[PDB]
Amino acid sequence: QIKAGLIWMNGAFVPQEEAKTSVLSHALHYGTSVFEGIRAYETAKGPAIFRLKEHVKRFYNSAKVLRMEIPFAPEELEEAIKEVVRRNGYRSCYIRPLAWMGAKALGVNPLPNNPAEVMVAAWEWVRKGARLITSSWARFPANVMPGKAKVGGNYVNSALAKMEAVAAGADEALLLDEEGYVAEGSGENLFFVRDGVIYALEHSVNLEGITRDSVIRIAKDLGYEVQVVRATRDQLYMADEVFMTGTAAEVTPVSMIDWRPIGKGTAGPVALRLREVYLEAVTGRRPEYEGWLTYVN
Amino acid sequence: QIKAGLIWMNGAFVPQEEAKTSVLSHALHYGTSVFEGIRAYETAKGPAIFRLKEHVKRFYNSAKVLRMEIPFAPEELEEAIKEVVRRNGYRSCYIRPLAWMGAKALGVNPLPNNPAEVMVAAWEWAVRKGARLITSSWARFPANVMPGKAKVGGNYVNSALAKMEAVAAGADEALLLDEEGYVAEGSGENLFFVRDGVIYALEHSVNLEGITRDSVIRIAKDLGYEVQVVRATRDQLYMADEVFMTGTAAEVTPVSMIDWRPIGKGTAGPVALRLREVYLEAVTGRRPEYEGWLTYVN
Amino acid sequence: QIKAGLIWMNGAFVPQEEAKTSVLSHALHYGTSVFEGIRAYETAKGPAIFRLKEHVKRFYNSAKVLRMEIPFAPEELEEAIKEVVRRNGYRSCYIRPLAWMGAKALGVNPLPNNPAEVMVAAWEWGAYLVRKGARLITSSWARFPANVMPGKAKVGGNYVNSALAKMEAVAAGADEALLLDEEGYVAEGSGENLFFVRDGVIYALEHSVNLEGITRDSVIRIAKDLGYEVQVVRATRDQLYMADEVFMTGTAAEVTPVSMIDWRPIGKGTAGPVALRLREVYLEAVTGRRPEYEGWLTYVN
Amino acid sequence: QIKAGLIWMNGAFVPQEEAKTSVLSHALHYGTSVFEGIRAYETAKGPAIFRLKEHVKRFYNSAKVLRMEIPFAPEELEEAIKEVVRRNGYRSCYIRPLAWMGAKALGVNPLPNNPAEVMVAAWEWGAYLGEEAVRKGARLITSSWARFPANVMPGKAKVGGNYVNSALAKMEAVAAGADEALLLDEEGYVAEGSGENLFFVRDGVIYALEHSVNLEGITRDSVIRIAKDLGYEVQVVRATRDQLYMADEVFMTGTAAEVTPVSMIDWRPIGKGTAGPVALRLREVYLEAVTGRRPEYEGWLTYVN
Amino acid sequence: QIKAGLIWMNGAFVPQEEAKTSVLSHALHYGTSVFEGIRAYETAKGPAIFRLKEHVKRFYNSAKVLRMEIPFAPEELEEAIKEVVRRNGYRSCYIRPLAWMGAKALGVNPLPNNPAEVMVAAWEWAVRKGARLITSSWARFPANVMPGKAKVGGNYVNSALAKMEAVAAGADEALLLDEEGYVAEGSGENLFFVRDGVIYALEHSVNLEGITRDSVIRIAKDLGYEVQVVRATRDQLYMADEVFMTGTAAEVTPVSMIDWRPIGKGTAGPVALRLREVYLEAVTGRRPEYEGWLTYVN
Amino acid sequence: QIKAGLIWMNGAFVPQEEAKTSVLSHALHYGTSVFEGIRAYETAKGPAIFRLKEHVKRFYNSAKVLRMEIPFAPEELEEAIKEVVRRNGYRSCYIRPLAWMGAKALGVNPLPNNPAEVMVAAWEWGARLITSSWARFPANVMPGKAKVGGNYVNSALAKMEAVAAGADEALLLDEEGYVAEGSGENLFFVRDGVIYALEHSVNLEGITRDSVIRIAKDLGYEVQVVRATRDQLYMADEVFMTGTAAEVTPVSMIDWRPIGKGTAGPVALRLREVYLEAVTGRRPEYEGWLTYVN
Numbered sequence A: 001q002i003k004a005g006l007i008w009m010n011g012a013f014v015p016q017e018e019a020k021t022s023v024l025s026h027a028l029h030y031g032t033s034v035f036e037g038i039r040a041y042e043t044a045k046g047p048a049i050f051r052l053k054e055h056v057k058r059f060y061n062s063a064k065v066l067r068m069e070i071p072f073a074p075e076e077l078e079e080a081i082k083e084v085v086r087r088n089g090y091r092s093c094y095i096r097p098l099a100w101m102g103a104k105a106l107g108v109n110p111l112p113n114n115p116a117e118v119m120v121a122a123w124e125w126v127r128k129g130a131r132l133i134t135s136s137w138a139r140f141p142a143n144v145m146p147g148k149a150k151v152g153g154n155y156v157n158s159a160l161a162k163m164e165a166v167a168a169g170a171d172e173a174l175l176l177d178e179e180g181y182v183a184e185g186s187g188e189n190l191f192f193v194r195d196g197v198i199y200a201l202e203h204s205v206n207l208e209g210i211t212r213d214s215v216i217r218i219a220k221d222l223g224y225e226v227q228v229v230r231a232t233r234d235q236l237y238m239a240d241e242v243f244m245t246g247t248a249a250e251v252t253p254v255s256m257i258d259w260r261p262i263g264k265g266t267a268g269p270v271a272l273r274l275r276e277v278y279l280e281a282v283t284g285r286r287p288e289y290e291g292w293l294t295y296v297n
Numbered sequence B, E: 001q002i003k004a005g006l007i008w009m010n011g012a013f014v015p016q017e018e019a020k021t022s023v024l025s026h027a028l029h030y031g032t033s034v035f036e037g038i039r040a041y042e043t044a045k046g047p048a049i050f051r052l053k054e055h056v057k058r059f060y061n062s063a064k065v066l067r068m069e070i071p072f073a074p075e076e077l078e079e080a081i082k083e084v085v086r087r088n089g090y091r092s093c094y095i096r097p098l099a100w101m102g103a104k105a106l107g108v109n110p111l112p113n114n115p116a117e118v119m120v121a122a123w124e125w126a127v128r129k130g131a132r133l134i135t136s137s138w139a140r141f142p143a144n145v146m147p148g149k150a151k152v153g154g155n156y157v158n159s160a161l162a163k164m165e166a167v168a169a170g171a172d173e174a175l176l177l178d179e180e181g182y183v184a185e186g187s188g189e190n191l192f193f194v195r196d197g198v199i200y201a202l203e204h205s206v207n208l209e210g211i212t213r214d215s216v217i218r219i220a221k222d223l224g225y226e227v228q229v230v231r232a233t234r235d236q237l238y239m240a241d242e243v244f245m246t247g248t249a250a251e252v253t254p255v256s257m258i259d260w261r262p263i264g265k266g267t268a269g270p271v272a273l274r275l276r277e278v279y280l281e282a283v284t285g286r287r288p289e290y291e292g293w294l295t296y297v298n
Numbered sequence C: 001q002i003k004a005g006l007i008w009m010n011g012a013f014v015p016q017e018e019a020k021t022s023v024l025s026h027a028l029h030y031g032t033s034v035f036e037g038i039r040a041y042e043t044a045k046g047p048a049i050f051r052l053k054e055h056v057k058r059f060y061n062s063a064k065v066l067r068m069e070i071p072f073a074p075e076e077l078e079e080a081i082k083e084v085v086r087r088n089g090y091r092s093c094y095i096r097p098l099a100w101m102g103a104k105a106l107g108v109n110p111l112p113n114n115p116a117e118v119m120v121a122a123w124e125w126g127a128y129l130v131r132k133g134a135r136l137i138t139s140s141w142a143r144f145p146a147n148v149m150p151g152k153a154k155v156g157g158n159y160v161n162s163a164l165a166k167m168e169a170v171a172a173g174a175d176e177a178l179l180l181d182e183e184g185y186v187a188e189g190s191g192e193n194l195f196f197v198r199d200g201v202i203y204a205l206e207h208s209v210n211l212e213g214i215t216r217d218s219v220i221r222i223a224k225d226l227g228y229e230v231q232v233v234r235a236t237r238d239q240l241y242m243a244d245e246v247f248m249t250g251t252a253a254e255v256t257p258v259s260m261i262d263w264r265p266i267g268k269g270t271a272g273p274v275a276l277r278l279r280e281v282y283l284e285a286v287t288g289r290r291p292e293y294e295g296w297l298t299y300v301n
Numbered sequence D: 001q002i003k004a005g006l007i008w009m010n011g012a013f014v015p016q017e018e019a020k021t022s023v024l025s026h027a028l029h030y031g032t033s034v035f036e037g038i039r040a041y042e043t044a045k046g047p048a049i050f051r052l053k054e055h056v057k058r059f060y061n062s063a064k065v066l067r068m069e070i071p072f073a074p075e076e077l078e079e080a081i082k083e084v085v086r087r088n089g090y091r092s093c094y095i096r097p098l099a100w101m102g103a104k105a106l107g108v109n110p111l112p113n114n115p116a117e118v119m120v121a122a123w124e125w126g127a128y129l130g131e132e133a134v135r136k137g138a139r140l141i142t143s144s145w146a147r148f149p150a151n152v153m154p155g156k157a158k159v160g161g162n163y164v165n166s167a168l169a170k171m172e173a174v175a176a177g178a179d180e181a182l183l184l185d186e187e188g189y190v191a192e193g194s195g196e197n198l199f200f201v202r203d204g205v206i207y208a209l210e211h212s213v214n215l216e217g218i219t220r221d222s223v224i225r226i227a228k229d230l231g232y233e234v235q236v237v238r239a240t241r242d243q244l245y246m247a248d249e250v251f252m253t254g255t256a257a258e259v260t261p262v263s264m265i266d267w268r269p270i271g272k273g274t275a276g277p278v279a280l281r282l283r284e285v286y287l288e289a290v291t292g293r294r295p296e297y298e299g300w301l302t303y304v305n
Numbered sequence F: 001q002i003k004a005g006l007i008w009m010n011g012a013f014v015p016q017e018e019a020k021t022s023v024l025s026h027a028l029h030y031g032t033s034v035f036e037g038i039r040a041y042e043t044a045k046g047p048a049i050f051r052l053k054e055h056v057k058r059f060y061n062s063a064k065v066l067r068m069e070i071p072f073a074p075e076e077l078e079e080a081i082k083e084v085v086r087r088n089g090y091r092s093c094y095i096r097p098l099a100w101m102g103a104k105a106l107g108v109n110p111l112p113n114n115p116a117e118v119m120v121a122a123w124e125w126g127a128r129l130i131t132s133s134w135a136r137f138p139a140n141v142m143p144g145k146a147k148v149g150g151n152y153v154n155s156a157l158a159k160m161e162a163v164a165a166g167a168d169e170a171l172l173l174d175e176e177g178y179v180a181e182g183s184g185e186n187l188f189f190v191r192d193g194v195i196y197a198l199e200h201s202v203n204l205e206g207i208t209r210d211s212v213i214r215i216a217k218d219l220g221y222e223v224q225v226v227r228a229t230r231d232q233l234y235m236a237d238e239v240f241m242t243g244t245a246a247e248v249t250p251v252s253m254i255d256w257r258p259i260g261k262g263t264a265g266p267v268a269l270r271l272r273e274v275y276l277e278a279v280t281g282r283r284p285e286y287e288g289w290l291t292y293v294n
Ligand SMILES: Cc1[nH+]cc(COP(=O)(O)O)c(CN[C@@H](CCC(=O)O)C(=O)O)c1O
Pocket: A036, A037, A038, A158, A184, A185, A186, A187, A188, A189, A206, A207, A208, A209, A210, A211, A212, A245, A246, A247, A248, A249, B106, B107, B108
């Protein structure tokens, strides 16, 4: 079981055992929910939530894609997110906001079910490099599933790929789009390095990662040249380095893809350095990035 | 609110109010659930569930796709489905079995959450004018993106988007095309068209293998119609003598217009209407040759 | 120049020189027209139009796709089609019915331009009545997906794709172009449907993104009547390269044996026995020499 | 009916009633024609045609795609385009040059029909002095018709046949209650409107869509230059429908559309739900440019008087 | 090392050691070769080659695709194939005929290199528990990218990549999907599935028109099975009662699992096992009805 | 026949007639080989191999895609490549390194056949294009970033088609309809003074393409990397191809439609001249790209 503790349920905190919803909820049957992944890191000045406003903005943006109505103002949700950390006495934790279509009706159309129900829960929270395998499941085309949003149903595609990779003996799955180009990991964005240049993948059908965005800024600040391009699986095979970014994965070096060693076959210097500086940034050690932090105290 | 009444929750019936699950359930966050749609009709011999066996079989098959483990034998679920009708005193109703990944963990990989939790709920459940459809701007998922042969919760985000669009456009239902441009299926039903006396069922492609579609093809052949299974384009439908949809909820529904273009005479056609009539006769227990499709609750 | 003669213009015949339309016509700028291609053959009983009703039905079906309103009943157009042959004294000829959006406005939306203007013209064709076989070349232009252009209708704009393919084929030294769909499978010729024969079996291609040819339909019925097994399938270019025979069908092409594709000889390298036989029977049918196919003919006199 | 007046027909102007062609013209049957869309605006120095040479260049480029021969030097067409404005006494008008394959033959191959016949027509265009419609923003709906792949129809050319695709999408959108259609390419990415190019704005940055299978808009080009001149950062990217749904602003550009703010797509409000400050500003400066009020953009204007 | 023995080289047999070609051969650089896979089985009347004529016909058909010229008459190759078996004293063996572009030049265009050089080699020649497959991340080539109806050397880079992936993942074979997401074929075999007693062969799509597939369909029909040819998705296979592959080397091989999802009972099924056994009886000369498919070497 | 002379075979030079391999070699049956194309030009200081380091790196990168093991260190291959020029007395030549899967087994899986066999041979060394009916392979069908033997069946089919159609070279589109590359060259086009290099997409990352971009930028030309359609090329002021063998080749016509003036344009001609000056060691700023054999 998950140790969440007090959970914010539509305006008020309640014990975990009470945070329940009808099994007739539209989202439990049709994947009609949206969520976010936000982290808080321990700093010298107490817990700090990383880029809270960008994550909340995306939460509401994801809802707009489903024409879902969130019956709370962003400011309220932001307060609830800060409270779920305080009330549970968390320091380093992962925060999971969730908006879903309730049980007013079960016709496939979700509009009659508005406004959505909302909740916020949270729980306490490489050298060799991660091993990836390209999935047999293609990332959804942009006119099939809304890839720029974190819609529950989207993750069926992520789930299928993740299970496949794990079953194949790898750590994570790398999905290609329907055209054969690299898209993203089941829950991460991808980058590769070649001849000193850092290449971030275009958005294509992927989620516009906030970690990806953060990584790019940091890389440029450190003096690296950054290019945004479309990439094939063999451009990664031949890269000096490859790494993934994501709220949970932070910056994760990738040492192998499809049993083919990337560069030296272990985490490379660029990825390790980016990961380290990113960690310094989220823990409040870089004044230049203080704007990204929200201290709960 | 939905008037379901007593709901079967993992082996036992409980009041609708007690039928709840954690908001940390994997399926609530990642669309990792499977469900079925089954109907019971009133007959002179009491309520009869239509093709219960095929529906339960597909329920388990859908789970297989997600590598989801349903901790109950098919027979148990079948008894539960009959009892949800009995205990609630239903005659004409829609039955909704649901299997979903619980709250053991929230990593995207659902395997650690097995076995799945299960519940069965049910609730009491123009035509000549014909239904009006509009082709959706959302394409049906390719066979290597989402498992279209299964009724996986997440799949219905695609259906929901198309349905909302169709309704917002003033139509009754959406018609989705696959990514290559061919007709696929409705947001919740299969498609057929008729041309020069020949009935054309659409290939399975990326669609669900409808049980109503299956029933309709058998009925059509029994009535003596030639049936061909083909791939179809939107303009083949525009030029057809008739078009109709099939589905557990839609039964056999004639389609009189698509994209503001009238189909044939612009109203329900004779073939679709005959198939609908025989189908209704079958599900209400008035066709001896199709009694094998019914499961009498009493 | 085209020797059309008397042309039916929205209800009445006028000399060719008078059959004109404004250069501001919607169809001249946006390809918003639909047309048909119908052949009339000289028979022992005078000119006979081949499957007139099927063509007229398709003409109206094509208009339906563009939400184009044709201000004439099918019966009126069929009478006009018969009359264009008679009034010009034609025997064997090609008939070109055309409906186009007029000059009421030039907004891209054609609806405000309804109803469409209509005309029926015809000219002598096939004044004389292959063994070497036609040479095809696979085009670099793909036949339009079914959600890009309405391939089941004969919409004017559709033929830009056909025109591009045909020019390419001729420039490459071939007789006709063979287009593939966007997925890579064989679709149809720039203006014909395709068939192939392998081990005695006749394979007609599925409709996919192609026009449902009336000649294709006729050839299939003829093949079955002759006792041939006919299968409808999806095909790749190399399935054709390896076939014993390949042939095209179309109102203008009739039944044309294909002896070479992409410089690779098909079977024996010349027209095969099956295609030649189907062609002979088809020609006997259209010229009124087959009682079993009289239903397909409409004698003008 | 269209009030065109005197029309330039293959070298000479004729009354509208006489500007006709045979119903056996190749282009009337097979969409084998090319055309342009050019605007003339009133200025303190009389009517000014916007980016005439760029439009004429595209006209001849479109013909090249069809292997169509235009039997007139670009200099002649440009003069005819000027004369069509003068002769008809127009101030604010839309100009429609057209080149189509004639009636020499009706084989699908158009080569035998060369050279193409040509005409230049024009009609008054009402100037908009209001603001409510503009500030309310246009409503778009994503079409069920995909924009043609680059190996199906030549999307960089203004070929008549191409517009069957645009027409089907426009009718659909209008029937759905929207003002315009937004077409996606076969892969699912945003392409362009039935007759406009698309842009979106996010966090102060202007994003122009890549050319992909779309027409390379001359208005799009002008808008990008204006934006850069005003100090905005402009990026060229590929976009999905949901990137537009969550953008701060979305707007269309086109000779007829000028710069049109888009406030809603698929019933989902864009940003504030009305025209945004960025699109409104670009429209403002664009209009000042075509009306001869921006000295820095005078090179784009051709005065007829 | 491969124990081939005497190899037929452009007209005459030579010791294996002498069966070599220039490293400047066009086919070694650009995949411009064609080949066949033919089997001989031991019968009561000595070695018998299975459907030699069809295989030779396909050999020349494949060459036609590359505009490759085989400087030998089919009858000559057929004799060479029979001789590679008897001169080596083989009973049960696999025969590999090969035609490749030589070292006349190395421009990518192979026409200047005609005619092709040809050789015929042969060597002495899962089913119990069923094979385990995994869907590849490499899509089968579209019909306008590589000629899938021909056995062109270059094509097998796609097969090789898929097979390596499947083996590295712990499976026996790879199942490739086409670019659209539908099931295509194995890296070296065709696919079939069984549902409710009905046998479903997959359409040719972008796959090779297998001779074993052809044989299997005829046998299945002769045995009274209903056989349908269709387009299939991965989940249609997941939900099938049985799945099996066919190929010259694979013969008829039952598939008990795909992507770690058990097929039906999770072991070789009865239909696949029966088709395999009847096929073996046919190739070993025990079924008079299929004698026409055999070419006795003695 | 090819006048190659002495060929480096797995560590040692041997006469051409002795450079042979078993007809049972995996690569001869399944296209499982990788190769390179390298040129040496005459200079005032003797023969110079152009960007040897980059070609060798790509060679090993190509093998990785097939999970092919090359039993020699890159430094060893470099020496062999230089030696093949020396020992044959070559000045202006084309060098063809090749690694292929041998005859240990003929199962489709190449792994059991490792390590690969390797050889290095060499021999003394506007355009009209036509768009091919064969599409360049998608990135999940064949590894387009590597020079794998099997990949060239697609190139061979397109080249034969172009030549049969009367053209000099074939222009392939990807499955989506966009321009990809030539059967053996990369493509660029010019419009209003701006040079447009095509994105890598499913193409090979040409070393000549890379060199041309640097040259262009040094000359002051603005260079943009974009995706392109066939009609963008039809409407361009110029079009040209780049490749080790093709160097910088102007394209005057595509699909019988003249490009711009219909003859080689000014930009392509200047890039060609600077490139030729560079490879022949007449450009000090580009000397880093040359490896002198003597
Ligand atoms: C498909 C997907 N792509 C990219 C990302 C990376 O985006 P960002 O987090 O904004 O940099 C994420 C979040 N991946 C979540 C994984 C869920 C888990 O608990 O595991 C995350 O990091 O919350 C995705 O789900």
